[PDB]
């Protein structure tokens, strides 16, 4: 006998069915489902429990899918891809509720607003950070940068948009000012992903310099906003936009890694305590199940791994 920690059927699961290189994956906030996609363009939905069967698959994308996030109420999935389009999928219907189309170059990264009106922040290789609204064809805000943007998030109040890119430094725009209120400086190479903390106080940002840097985005900080740096993961010559994600308890942080290992760090000490093998290629995305200590990781090896951990 051995210790168990989740309702998974086995302490790790191997999900097979993809043929494309899986570039993104996220859980539904209700914990019932996860959705995963990448170069196959098909978005695969999986149940979290039991046989974890691939109950649904959505086509419709025709350029590979960079990033994919659920809306907070789990009514819709927002996903974006290199077809220069942001597509919002109704979870009950499995159909494209909105197809935002004003980007001029590949859209790589997406983040829905947490509450209030449903807004979708997006960042692209045209250098624009754009916030779309479900109710209008035209976007609400377009913030233009000289250099391509490949990561985006709102803050928790959904009134500051944080975008990172080729600049390494970060264009953080405040939606009442339409100005950069501050920049976060420490990244020596491009920013492959940004994820907002559950409470919204912090963001982690992952970069091709092989570090994750934790930033305090609260309105007042008396000094430098850099809280800490995490290392151990690696970015290879593929230059992927390796993502990052928070644990819902905030005590743990994850990032994609080219060395096949699933990294977990302790937020305060920045030490590693989980280094989980099993992948055969670049782990492009990693996420925590929102209610249960299940780790999701999606890799360039065409495989999705579910596994349970002792989150302490």
């Amino acid at each position: 006998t051995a210790q168990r920690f989740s309702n998974l059927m086995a302490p790790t699961m191997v999900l097979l069915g993809h043929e494309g290189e899986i570039y993104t994956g996220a859980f539904s906030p209700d914990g019932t489902c996860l959705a995963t996609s990448g170069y196959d363009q098909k978005i695969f939905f999986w149940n979290v429990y039991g046989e974890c069967e691939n109950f649904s698959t959505i086509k419709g994308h025709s350029g590979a899918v960079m990033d994919l996030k659920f809306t907070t109420d789990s009514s819709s999935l927002v996903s974006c891809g290199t077809d220069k389009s942001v597509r919002v999928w109704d979870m009950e219907t499995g159909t494209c509720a909105r197809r935002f189309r004003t980007h001029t170059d590949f859209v790589n990264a997406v983040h829905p607003s947490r509450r209030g009106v449903t807004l979708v922040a997006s960042a692209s290789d045209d250098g624009t950070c754009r916030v779309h609204d479900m109710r209008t064809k035209e976007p609400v805000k377009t913030y233009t940068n000289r250099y391509q943007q490949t990561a985006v998030t709102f803050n928790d109040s959904s009134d500051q948009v944080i975008s990172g890119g080729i600049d390494n430094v970060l264009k953080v725009w405040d939606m009442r000012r339409d100005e950069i209120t501050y920049t976060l400086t420490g990244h020596r190479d491009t920013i492959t992903g940004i994820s907002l903390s559950p409470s919204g106080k912090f963001i982690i940002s992952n970069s091709m310099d092989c570090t994750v840097r934790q930033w305090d985005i609260r309105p007042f900080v008396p000094g430098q906003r850099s809280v800490g740096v995490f290392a151990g993961h690696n970015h290879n010559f593929e230059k992927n936009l390796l993502k990052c994600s928070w644990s819902p308890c905030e005590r743990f942080i994850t990032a994609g890694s080219s060395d096949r290992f699933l990294y977990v760090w302790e937020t305060l000490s920045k030490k590693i305590v989980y280094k989980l093998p099993g992948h055969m290629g670049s782990v492009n995305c990693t996420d925590f199940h929102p209610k249960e200590p299940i780790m999701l990781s999606c890799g360039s090896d065409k495989r999705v791994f579910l596994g349970e951990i002792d989150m302490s």
């Binding site: 010559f237 992927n240 055969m280 290629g281 670049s282 360039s300």
Partner: peptide, 14 residues
């Protein structure tokens, strides 16, 4: 010896 998968195009570049 272990199997691997990569971004073919980028491996071709290198």
């Amino acid at each position: 010896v272990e199997p691997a998968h990569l971004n073919e195009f980028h491996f071709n570049r290198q």
